[PDB]
From a paper:
Tripartite motif (TRIM) proteins constitute one of the largest subfamilies of the RING-type E3 ubiquitin ligases that play a role in diverse processes from homeostasis and immune response to viral restriction. The NHL domain, or so-called NHL repeats named after ncl-1, HT2A and lin-41, forms another protein module found in four TRIMs, including TRIM2, TRIM3, TRIM32 and TRIM71, that constitute the subclass VII. Here, high-resolution crystal structures of the NHL domains of three of the four human TRIM–NHL proteins, namely TRIM2, TRIM3 and TRIM71, are presented. Comparative structural analyses revealed that, despite sharing an evolutionarily conserved six-bladed β-propeller architecture, the low sequence identities resulted in distinct properties of these interaction domains at their putative binding sites for macromolecules.
The NHL domains of TRIM2 and TRIM3 were highly expressed as a fusion protein with an N-terminal His6-GST tag in E. coli. For TRIM2, the structure was refined to a high resolution of 1.45 Å, and the crystals belonged to the monoclinic P21 space group with four molecules in the asymmetric unit. Nonetheless, an exception was noted when comparing TRIM2 and TRIM3 that were most similar with ∼82% sequence identity. In contrast, the rather shallow flat surface of the TRIM2/3 NHLs resembles that of their homologue DmBrat, which has been shown to recognize a linear RNA. However, comparative analyses suggest that similar binding of an RNA observed previously in DmBrat would be unlikely in TRIM2/3 due to the lack of a central channel as well as low sequence conservation within the pockets. TRIM2 NHL has been shown to interact with the motor-protein myosin V, and the function of this E3 ligase has been linked to neuronal activity including neurons and axon growth. In line with this, genetic studies have unveiled a number of mutations in the NHL motifs of TRIMs with a link to diverse pathological outcomes, in particular, diverse neurological disorders. This includes a link of the mutations in TRIM2 NHL to Charcot-Marie-Tooth disease (CMT), congenital bilateral vocal-cord paralysis (BVCP) and axonal neuropathy. A frameshift within blade 2 (K567Rfs7X) undoubtedly leads to a loss of the NHL domain, whereas the other nonsense mutation (R741X) results in the loss of four amino acids at the C terminus on the bottom surface. The other mutations include a substitution, D640A, and a deletion, N594del, both of which are located in the proximity of the central groove on the top surface, thus they could affect directly the integrity of the intermolecular interface.
Numbering used by the authors: 467 to 744
The structure:
């Protein structure tokens, strides 16, 4: 299979600029940037939407303003960069140039992964290890928390990533329950979708997620390494065609300001950018 929906790929294994060890979170900004968090290189790298390297920041360590196992990444409308740290157990807010401003969740989080910003400016934090989701004020006060460890609708099993749709509904990938779950802005369960398998519309261990302007939910899965698109009611629509250069254990996923889908192809030490809107 010679061609698919891939536009370009960036990255090889390593610790230098444009190289990766463990791609995790992916974010994309309204200023036309792609941001990649690397949990094992302890850095965030910023690229243009066309894949050109722009900048890198991240100081290894366990103190405030350092990164130890950075996972989720989001960009605030302000341009600040929000980074979850699984090992430091807090979420940092950096400037667009990587200056540490504040951290939230310290003493509250067990092991965060996904981070997002809701339509009201709340910071949504997926606590992968605690199997719950927090909604924080920017000052670090908890608005609400939802979920606990388990297999049921209102539980999570290693939740990974988050997205927020135009109705301020929160979308969570529930990795070890093989489903995507949608909540209202109060954190109350609305619906789940997905099934564990290899056939059409099925997946295994959903990871990266995004939601488009029409409410369609774009989901990467770690176990089959595909990207599947669902409508906002959770019904399968289509694949993003990755067959010419397959994924291997994808992590974070984002929609870019130029209408593409970017995915962390972590097992192949690269990010891949796909046609989506055109």
């Amino acid at each position: 299979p010679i061609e698919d929906d891939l536009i370009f790929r960036v990255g090889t294994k390593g610790r230098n600029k444009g190289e990766f060890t463990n791609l995790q979170g992916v974010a994309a900004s309204t200023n036309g940037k792609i941001l990649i968090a690397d949990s094992n290189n302890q850095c965030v790298q910023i690229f243009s939407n066309d894949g050109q390297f722009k900048s890198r920041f991240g100081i290894r360590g366990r103190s405030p303003g350092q990164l130890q196992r950075p996972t989720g990444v989001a960009v605030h409308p302000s341009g600040d960069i929000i980074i979850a740290d699984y090992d430091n157990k807090w979420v940092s807010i950096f400037s667009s140039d990587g200056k540490f401003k504040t951290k939230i969740g310290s003493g509250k989080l067990m092991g965060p992964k996904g981070v997002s910003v809701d339509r009201n400016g709340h910071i949504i934090v997926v606590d992968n290890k605690a199997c719950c989701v927090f909604i924080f004020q920017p000052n670090g006060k908890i608005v609400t928390r939802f979920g606990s460890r388990g297999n049921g609708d209102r539980q999570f099993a290693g939740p990974h990533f988050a997205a927020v749709n135009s109705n301020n509904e929160i979308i969570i990938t529930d990795f070890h329950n093989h489903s995507v779950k949608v909540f209202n802005q109060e954190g109350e369960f609305m619906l789940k979708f997905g099934s564990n398998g290899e056939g059409n519309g099925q997946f295994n261990a959903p990871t990266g997620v995004a939601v488009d302007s029409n409410g369609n939910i774009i989901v990467a899965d770690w176990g089959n390494s595909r990207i599947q698109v669902f409508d906002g009611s959770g019904s399968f629509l289509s694949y993003i065609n990755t067959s010419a250069d397959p994924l291997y254990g994808p992590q974070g996923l984002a929609l870019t300001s130029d209408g593409h889908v970017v995915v962390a192809d972590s097992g192949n030490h690269c990010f891949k950018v796909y046609r989506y809107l055109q």
